Design an enzyme around this catalytic site. Sequence first.
Site, PDB file in Angstrom:
ATOM      1  N   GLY A  52       0.819  -1.203   0.000  1.00  0.00           N
ATOM      2  CA  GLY A  52       0.000   0.000   0.000  1.00  0.00           C
ATOM      3  C   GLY A  52       0.857   1.258   0.000  1.00  0.00           C
ATOM      4  O   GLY A  52       1.945   1.286  -0.575  1.00  0.00           O
TER       5      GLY A  52
ATOM      6  N   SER B 126       5.569  -5.910  -0.784  1.00  0.00           N
ATOM      7  CA  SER B 126       5.778  -4.473  -0.965  1.00  0.00           C
ATOM      8  C   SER B 126       5.873  -3.822   0.409  1.00  0.00           C
ATOM      9  O   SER B 126       6.738  -4.232   1.206  1.00  0.00           O
ATOM     10  CB  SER B 126       4.664  -3.970  -1.882  1.00  0.00           C
ATOM     11  OG  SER B 126       5.093  -2.880  -2.670  1.00  0.00           O
ATOM     12  N   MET B 127       5.044  -2.827   0.743  1.00  0.00           N
ATOM     13  CA  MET B 127       5.100  -2.247   2.080  1.00  0.00           C
ATOM     14  C   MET B 127       4.713  -3.256   3.158  1.00  0.00           C
ATOM     15  O   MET B 127       5.075  -3.071   4.326  1.00  0.00           O
ATOM     16  CB  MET B 127       4.208  -1.003   2.153  1.00  0.00           C
ATOM     17  CG  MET B 127       4.161  -0.347   3.529  1.00  0.00           C
ATOM     18  SD  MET B 127       5.702   0.434   4.086  1.00  0.00           S
ATOM     19  CE  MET B 127       6.162   1.418   2.678  1.00  0.00           C
TER      20      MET B 127
ATOM     21  N   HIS C 260       9.740  -5.115  -4.024  1.00  0.00           N
ATOM     22  CA  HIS C 260       9.957  -4.416  -5.283  1.00  0.00           C
ATOM     23  C   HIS C 260      10.057  -2.924  -4.993  1.00  0.00           C
ATOM     24  O   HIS C 260       9.793  -2.470  -3.879  1.00  0.00           O
ATOM     25  CB  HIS C 260       8.853  -4.729  -6.305  1.00  0.00           C
ATOM     26  CG  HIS C 260       7.500  -4.182  -5.958  1.00  0.00           C
ATOM     27  ND1 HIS C 260       6.404  -4.349  -6.779  1.00  0.00           N
ATOM     28  CD2 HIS C 260       7.059  -3.479  -4.887  1.00  0.00           C
ATOM     29  CE1 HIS C 260       5.350  -3.768  -6.233  1.00  0.00           C
ATOM     30  NE2 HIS C 260       5.721  -3.231  -5.086  1.00  0.00           N
TER      31      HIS C 260
ATOM     32  N   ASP D 197       9.638  -7.096  -9.558  1.00  0.00           N
ATOM     33  CA  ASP D 197       9.000  -7.923  -8.542  1.00  0.00           C
ATOM     34  C   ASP D 197       9.879  -9.124  -8.219  1.00  0.00           C
ATOM     35  O   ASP D 197      10.379  -9.812  -9.115  1.00  0.00           O
ATOM     36  CB  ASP D 197       7.619  -8.386  -9.014  1.00  0.00           C
ATOM     37  CG  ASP D 197       6.565  -7.305  -8.882  1.00  0.00           C
ATOM     38  OD1 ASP D 197       6.922  -6.174  -8.496  1.00  0.00           O
ATOM     39  OD2 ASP D 197       5.380  -7.590  -9.153  1.00  0.00           O
TER      40      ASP D 197
HETATM   41  C1  LIG Z   1       7.377   0.549  -0.433  1.00  0.00           C
HETATM   42  C2  LIG Z   1       7.525  -0.164  -1.817  1.00  0.00           C
HETATM   43  C3  LIG Z   1       7.884  -1.675  -1.596  1.00  0.00           C
HETATM   44  C4  LIG Z   1       6.203   0.011  -2.679  1.00  0.00           C
HETATM   45  C5  LIG Z   1       4.924   0.074  -1.838  1.00  0.00           C
HETATM   46  N1  LIG Z   1       4.029   1.201  -2.159  1.00  0.00           N
HETATM   47  C6  LIG Z   1       4.014   2.051  -3.403  1.00  0.00           C
HETATM   48  O1  LIG Z   1       4.781   1.952  -4.302  1.00  0.00           O
HETATM   49  C7  LIG Z   1       2.946   3.143  -3.470  1.00  0.00           C
HETATM   50  C8  LIG Z   1       1.841   2.784  -4.472  1.00  0.00           C
HETATM   51  C9  LIG Z   1       0.607   3.738  -4.323  1.00  0.00           C
HETATM   52  C10 LIG Z   1      -0.684   3.304  -4.647  1.00  0.00           C
HETATM   53  C11 LIG Z   1      -1.767   4.184  -4.501  1.00  0.00           C
HETATM   54  C12 LIG Z   1      -1.577   5.481  -4.035  1.00  0.00           C
HETATM   55  C13 LIG Z   1      -0.287   5.917  -3.708  1.00  0.00           C
HETATM   56  C14 LIG Z   1       0.786   5.042  -3.856  1.00  0.00           C
HETATM   57  N2  LIG Z   1       3.689   4.327  -3.854  1.00  0.00           N
HETATM   58  C15 LIG Z   1       3.771   5.421  -2.867  1.00  0.00           C
HETATM   59  O2  LIG Z   1       3.220   5.325  -1.809  1.00  0.00           O
HETATM   60  C16 LIG Z   1       4.588   6.688  -3.236  1.00  0.00           C
HETATM   61  C17 LIG Z   1       3.983   7.789  -3.843  1.00  0.00           C
HETATM   62  N3  LIG Z   1       4.737   8.847  -4.138  1.00  0.00           N
HETATM   63  C18 LIG Z   1       6.031   8.858  -3.869  1.00  0.00           C
HETATM   64  C19 LIG Z   1       6.637   7.761  -3.266  1.00  0.00           C
HETATM   65  N4  LIG Z   1       5.876   6.704  -2.973  1.00  0.00           N
HETATM   66  B1  LIG Z   1       4.023  -1.179  -2.120  1.00  0.00           B
HETATM   67  O3  LIG Z   1       3.115  -1.474  -1.167  1.00  0.00           O
HETATM   68  O4  LIG Z   1       3.656  -1.405  -3.401  1.00  0.00           O
END
Ligand SMILES: CC(C)C[C@@H](NC(=O)[C@H](Cc1ccccc1)NC(=O)c1cnccn1)B(O)O
Lengths: 175, 175, 175, 175, 175, 175, 175, 175, 175, 175
Positions: I51, I80-81, I105, I154
């Site tokens: 997220g 991811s997060m 990723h 990924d």
């Molecule tokens: C931590 C890493 C492993 C990836 C994780 N999150 C992301 O990539 C998110 C995806 C997103 C989806 C909907 C709305 C917002 C963002 N990207 C950000 O939050 C973001 C935005 N702007 C600048 C920097 N980062 B993972 O959970 O996919």
Amino acid sequence: DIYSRLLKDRIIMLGSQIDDNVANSIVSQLLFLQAQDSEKDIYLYINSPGGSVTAGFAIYDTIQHIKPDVQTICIGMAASMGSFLLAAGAKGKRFALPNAEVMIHQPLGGAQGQATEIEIAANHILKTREKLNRILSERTGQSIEKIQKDTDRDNFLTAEEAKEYGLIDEVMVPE
Amino acid sequence: DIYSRLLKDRIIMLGSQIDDNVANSIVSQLLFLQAQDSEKDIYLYINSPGGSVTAGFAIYDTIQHIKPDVQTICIGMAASMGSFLLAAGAKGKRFALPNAEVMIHQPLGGAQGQATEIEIAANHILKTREKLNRILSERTGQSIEKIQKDTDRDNFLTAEEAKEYGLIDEVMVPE
Amino acid sequence: DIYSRLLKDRIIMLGSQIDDNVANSIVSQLLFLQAQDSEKDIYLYINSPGGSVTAGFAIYDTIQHIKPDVQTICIGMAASMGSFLLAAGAKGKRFALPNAEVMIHQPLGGAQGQATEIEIAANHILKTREKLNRILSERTGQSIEKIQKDTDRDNFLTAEEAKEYGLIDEVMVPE
Amino acid sequence: DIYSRLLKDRIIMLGSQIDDNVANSIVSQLLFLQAQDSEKDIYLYINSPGGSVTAGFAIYDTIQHIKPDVQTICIGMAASMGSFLLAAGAKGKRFALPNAEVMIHQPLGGAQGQATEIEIAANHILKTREKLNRILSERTGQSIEKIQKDTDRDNFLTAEEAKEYGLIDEVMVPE
Amino acid sequence: DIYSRLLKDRIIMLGSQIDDNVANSIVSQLLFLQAQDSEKDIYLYINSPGGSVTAGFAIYDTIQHIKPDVQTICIGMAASMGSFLLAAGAKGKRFALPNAEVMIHQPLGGAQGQATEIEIAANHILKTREKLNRILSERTGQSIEKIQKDTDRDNFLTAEEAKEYGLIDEVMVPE
Amino acid sequence: DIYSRLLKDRIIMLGSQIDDNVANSIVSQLLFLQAQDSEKDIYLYINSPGGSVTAGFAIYDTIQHIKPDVQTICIGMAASMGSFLLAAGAKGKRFALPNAEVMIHQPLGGAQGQATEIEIAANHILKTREKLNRILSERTGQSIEKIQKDTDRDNFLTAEEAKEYGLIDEVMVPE
Amino acid sequence: DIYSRLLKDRIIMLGSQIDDNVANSIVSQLLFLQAQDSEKDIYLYINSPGGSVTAGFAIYDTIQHIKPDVQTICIGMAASMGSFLLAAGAKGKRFALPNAEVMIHQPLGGAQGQATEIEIAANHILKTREKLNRILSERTGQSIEKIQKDTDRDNFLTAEEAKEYGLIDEVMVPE
Amino acid sequence: DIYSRLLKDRIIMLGSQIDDNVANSIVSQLLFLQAQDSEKDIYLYINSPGGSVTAGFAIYDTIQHIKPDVQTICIGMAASMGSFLLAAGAKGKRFALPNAEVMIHQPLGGAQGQATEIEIAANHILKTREKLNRILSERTGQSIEKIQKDTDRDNFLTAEEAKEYGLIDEVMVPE
Amino acid sequence: DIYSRLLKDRIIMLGSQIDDNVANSIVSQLLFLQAQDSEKDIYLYINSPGGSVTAGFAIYDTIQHIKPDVQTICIGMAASMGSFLLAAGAKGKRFALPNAEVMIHQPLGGAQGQATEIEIAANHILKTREKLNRILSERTGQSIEKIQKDTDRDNFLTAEEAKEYGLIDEVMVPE
Amino acid sequence: DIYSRLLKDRIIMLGSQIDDNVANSIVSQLLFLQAQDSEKDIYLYINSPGGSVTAGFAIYDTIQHIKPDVQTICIGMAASMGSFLLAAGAKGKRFALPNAEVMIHQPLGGAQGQATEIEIAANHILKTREKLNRILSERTGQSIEKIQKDTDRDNFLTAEEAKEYGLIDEVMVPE
Ligand SMILES: CC(C)C[C@@H](NC(=O)[C@H](Cc1ccccc1)NC(=O)c1cnccn1)B(O)O
Ligand SMILES: CC(C)C[C@@H](NC(=O)[C@H](Cc1ccccc1)NC(=O)c1cnccn1)B(O)O
Ligand SMILES: CC(C)C[C@@H](NC(=O)[C@H](Cc1ccccc1)NC(=O)c1cnccn1)B(O)O
Ligand SMILES: CC(C)C[C@@H](NC(=O)[C@H](Cc1ccccc1)NC(=O)c1cnccn1)B(O)O
Ligand SMILES: CC(C)C[C@@H](NC(=O)[C@H](Cc1ccccc1)NC(=O)c1cnccn1)B(O)O
Ligand SMILES: CC(C)C[C@@H](NC(=O)[C@H](Cc1ccccc1)NC(=O)c1cnccn1)B(O)O
Ligand SMILES: CC(C)C[C@@H](NC(=O)[C@H](Cc1ccccc1)NC(=O)c1cnccn1)B(O)O
Ligand SMILES: CC(C)C[C@@H](NC(=O)[C@H](Cc1ccccc1)NC(=O)c1cnccn1)B(O)O
Ligand SMILES: CC(C)C[C@@H](NC(=O)[C@H](Cc1ccccc1)NC(=O)c1cnccn1)B(O)O
Ligand SMILES: CC(C)C[C@@H](NC(=O)[C@H](Cc1ccccc1)NC(=O)c1cnccn1)B(O)O
């Protein structure tokens, strides 16, 4: 509900976009907390991407009006009106967690219609920006002319940068 | 096609909303008619609700630039940029049919985004209104302050009132 | 195309709702026909449910302006602006087929916005109704106040009733 | 195009729903055919699910008005206003192919608004039904009240039944 | 078609948003015109709100490459890539009509996906902006540093201001 | 039409996304030009964002298979399959205009269904990528290892960089 | 519920658009609070963009009717019908927080249908504007002529300007 | 919930459009209140734009049938069936607040299908209008002929005009 | 509710996408649990596809900022997060069930607008990726450059591979 | 609620598609049931068409990791991941009702994007299939080679066939 529990410890969570619904909830929580006890501190956690200016001012003015000190704590992110309300906490009691992000930028809006209606709307948003700049200047110590330049575009700040900016007083270290 | 044979009589029909496609068609027709003969008059029939200001000026400036006199004949309705182009015909040769209606009003538009971008758009449309008022004042003989007041809201004019105003020279009687 | 062949016999078919496209085609056909010969009659067949007032007035004023008599012949139906244009033909040369229907009623429209904008729109449509009533009174011989009462709601007329109303001069019998 | 070669043999195909566009095409073809020769017969092939009453009367009245006899030949299906026009051919010259279907029923419509507007619409459609019933009675040799009873609901007829009813004169046999 | 016979006068109309379709049409006209005669001038009328950078460079590079001088005449509006192409005409032969509008601003785009793909898109659009600034500096005599600051936001210019800026050489007076 | 004129000069414009319709048109134009004359060169102008691999390979194989040399000239932009076809022109006769952009990247696709269905689609696209990499390696004089690494992500190249890379032979300078 | 506890302190929150649902909730709360105690004050917090005129008058008339004084406190914004209700609090007890914004403008609406229907709707909204102007004149001490000019377009007021205008009695200082 | 405690004071709020849901709620409240006590009054507050005739008659007939007097108090607006229910309160006990609006007009509906189905619907709505007029004449003392003429179109009444008309007995003053 | 009984065993389930609502719920539960007892462990079960970065950092910073150890247990999948928070548990107390999947990723995002706006967004996401890489390097004992390369695309890991990577300390055996 | 009452008897009903919400509910019910008593048996009724693999493994690993025996009873249908969880109950305590249906097949998914991204997803789903096959081989006693071929397409099994296959231990007979 978990937020009911936290309200007994005088904790308010602002964890969403700020519209009128959210603002009336936050305002009513502040007034309710002041009624129960008017000298014990209140803690406002902020994780917000921003929102409406007038809704934000509803919360701002209530914070300044009530008797108890309102501590502000940024977790995750305080952007736009969220960072404005972060800077609004009791001076010396404005905090952010070490990895929180803070973002400031100028207001946005829209206008449609006749030339005179567009002129009225543009004048209103420019007045709204000058008012936000002047208050942020008073809360941070930045000059108005510097606020104006630093908010021309999106300006992302780390917690440490937010402290040196004057938006907060301390980065909260563990724990 | 019927309009092609009318073009051989040096007649152009502006009978729709004025966008860039229409303006290019009209401009190219005026250019083509000037090339065939640069001193015989051209007849521009106008039945239009108006349209884009820059598309309108593309036609306005082409009319002013070419050698032949361009007569303007309002049939049905000339509103907004339509009536602006009606007033742009060769002086002495601007007409309206007895039951045509002419409408004038101030420009309309829209703006979205940051405060500084809304201000840029507001300044652009106010400047555009000043330019239109100034030219209409020159075409009608009315003062800029009167134009500005008379176009604050939608202003509907009969063919006779359009003549008294200076938007046209004569009402066309049968036959 | 079949209508091209009919235009050779100076016949124009108005067989659709009247908007600006239809009006410009009809107007250009009238002017084209006058150019070819300015004394031979023109025949306008009408099968129309009506349409825009200003588009209708584009056709009306062109009919009154050109030299040749324009005969009007209702087939099927002449409603609203369609019956207004039926009554506009050369007096003595306005016809309907025996089972054609004719319908008259008052104008319709809409308005939204500020109270002053709605006031402006209401005033424009009431002025437009008074103008239509005055012209219909002149084309039929009915008084303006009788037109006003008779068009308050939808008023359907047989071909024979339309003749006694003065909208046409004769019901066309075979052959 | 195939239909224009057929027009040279004085053949008109009515093969779709009857709206104003279709009615004006058919009407113009009848007038054109009468102009080329005012005595030689015309052949109107009918394959239609029906359509607008007023558009159908535009074709009906043009059929009665012109000098040449108009033969009607149902191929496939003549329903609703299609079967009305099938019965409208020159008596003795109304045919159906052996497996064509003929359908008759009462008019349909709709009405929305104030009680007085609904009453106006109801009266208009009831009057329309009476006028159709009277003509069909004259064309078929059936009584008005039998027509009324037999069209209360959809009434499907074979070619032979349509002859027995009076809607056509003969069923067309090979060759 | 009107644009065809204008092409025999060596006239090309750019009167729309610039995409690949439009660009390929303009490019082929420039090539076609050079083939028929490679020394007589070409006239490129510009009424365009802009469009794709690469589509714009297809036209730009073709203009520079062919041997005939390409005059550019702004009617109505030349915004964004439209004003870039206006400044690309043969020096001394770049015009605007007295009420034409010129607008200049920085490129816009979008990027979605992984961080490294966003970085690739950001680097590509910033490189594109540097290339546009450098060419516009060469065409206008202004410095790259001034172009950069003047295109930070939308910058509307009158015909007279565009001449002072160096985008055009003369404002075209009647007649 | 303007492109028919250019085809008499043996000029083909590939100015759009490459799908099966476009490919069949280009292929048929190449076959038609070879039949008219099998020794005089052909000129393929490329302004394309890419498209289907198989549609692209239809054009590629046809270029390799016809007797005449096929010159390729990038105007505006050759990305993806567009740049693959640019590199496919007769060596020594591959060109780009000075501000044309070239982009290379690996293929894209999609797969849905059972595990074995996804594996089949994965193997097919990996084999497709390996074939494209090998052929591009031969057109450019680069190793397959370098093509693989350089197309992992979007890779934008100026005209001069494309010449350095071996995708074109010369940047076309004016006259 | 947080709003339920505040009702214990005779506090009512009007923090949304004013429609019939909201108005009935506010009205029932005023009725309920009067029944519990008819002489202790009631506190009406207003953060509203406005809404329906008749729903607003349902609240206005209930405020005027009941025994207890009703204090009004604008937090955030009182626009349009919201500012009308702000001015309706017990004189001497109408407040606004220092950064609250007040906006006043004339009513808006819409009308569709026959000319006589549009005239009826126009007369209704103009009569409604005269009633609102008269009451606001009584509540603020400003003349009806001044109200009418000042509400021609959107008119934004600071808390201090709202006090100068007579819409509120005091700006609430901390604390 | 607030409406529950109001029901203990025998107060019923009709503050919405009248459909079957609302009607069944109102009806059950009236009977429930009669069961608890059959002689103390009931108070029905009305803020309604109107709604279904049959749903309205469910409420009307229940009001007449039960033993206790039902006072009616219009706040905000009583339009259409809402004003009918306002006039239905116990005579002497029908009120409106000073700025309440009252509107009366004739019923509306729609009908689709065969001519005989349209006739049935027309007859049903005309019968319904006669029944509404006759009851309103009895509740107000006005004649049926005056009700018919006064409800031909939308008829807006002030609280004072509604008293003169006989729809209410008194305008209720503060306090 | 089942989750509230688990909360009394100090068990928090993170079983969804991580947005602001989820982050504020989790943060609230950590704070609440620390308040009840500040030394007894907390158990955070993680089944999440990932997220928002800022929402994730709200949870991350709260985990580091409470006194009690937070054990993390991945069930099903931590992507991811989700996997970032899995690595965030108290060292020695980070677990995964034997068939849970772990995916890592690089961050994703988007950017629209002017070139300068796209550059601001690109720099912010690149800085975000660097900050995430450095923390994960500290929590896993892998180098920044290895994290960078292993998250370019990924990267799916079994429970055993996640232990070898340093994202968890043990694979939890039955039972 | 009925499921609460059955949880008293240690009954958990999995009666829906398996996503992350359902998996977290089932997992939390298992943990809660183990806390109340860690040696009493748990009964998991299964009526499920399947769902996410990782959500299913969250339930699977929790079943193997708690102390109590988990009996599985298939009512209606256990398809896909539903049948995987059926085979996961304590050996000797896996049941199906006589008319329950069991279905097994290979995993499904989808992949979009660059060739390398489709390869990653293809490899991931293939690895997942191999892990699922190995575990089912262990739960049923069948060889991995037999599972692979029997799951190539949809493979529907009766309760009796599921017992022969090793997915369940006994078909439950009444009573
Ligand atoms: C931590 C890493 C492993 C990836 C994780 N999150 C992301 O990539 C998110 C995806 C997103 C989806 C909907 C709305 C917002 C963002 N990207 C950000 O939050 C973001 C935005 N702007 C600048 C920097 N980062 B993972 O959970 O996919
Ligand atoms: C410090 C400040 C930058 C905070 C927020 N900024 C804004 O611009 C909001 C955006 C908005 C939200 C909902 C609907 C429309 C617009 N603008 C207004 O409320 C506004 C005020 N006065 C006149 C016109 N608009 B932030 O969250 O970005
Ligand atoms: C008042 C009259 C002389 C001319 C026209 N009035 C206008 O307002 C047009 C309407 C429009 C409609 C849709 C899309 C865009 C524009 N406005 C502009 O072109 C414009 C120019 N510069 C800045 C902002 N807007 B009329 O004929 O409609
Ligand atoms: C004799 C007359 C009754 C004929 C036409 N009547 C009308 O009402 C048309 C209807 C209309 C159609 C489409 C869109 C909007 C309006 N009204 C106007 O054109 C109008 C309105 N307001 C001011 C000026 N003109 B008829 O043939 O429909
Ligand atoms: C002999 C006759 C039964 C034939 C047609 N019957 C109809 O009902 C058509 C149907 C229709 C189609 C499009 C739009 C509306 C209505 N009705 C009218 O045209 C009509 C209705 N009301 C008043 C005046 N005319 B048939 O083809 O079905
Ligand atoms: C400064 C001025 C000369 C720019 C003109 N065009 C643009 O900015 C376009 C906007 C656009 C148009 C169609 C499709 C997508 C985007 N942007 C690009 O083409 C672009 C973006 N990123 C990398 C490379 N190119 B003008 O018309 O605004
Ligand atoms: C890499 C470059 C030389 C050429 C183009 N690359 C592509 O990936 C195209 C995009 C596509 C088009 C239509 C439908 C789906 C995908 N892919 C295929 O045609 C394809 C994919 N998988 C197997 C076989 N073929 B370029 O324009 O990006
Ligand atoms: C306080 C006053 C100066 C403006 C306020 N309300 C209005 O103008 C509303 C806008 C509206 C909202 C919802 C539904 C319909 C209309 N107009 C009417 O209620 C109305 C009454 N009578 C006749 C026509 N219209 B404000 O809050 O904007
Ligand atoms: C005069 C005044 C008392 C009318 C009230 N209602 C109406 O006119 C409604 C409008 C309607 C509402 C819902 C669904 C459909 C139609 N019409 C009918 O209920 C109806 C009943 N029988 C036959 C035909 N129509 B008022 O309150 O609007
Ligand atoms: C028991 C097993 C053989 C099939 C079961 N589930 C699947 O195949 C699902 C289908 C699906 C459901 C929701 C969202 C996406 C895909 N696939 C995955 O979960 C998956 C696996 N590996 C990589 C990526 N995804 B069954 O219930 O159909």
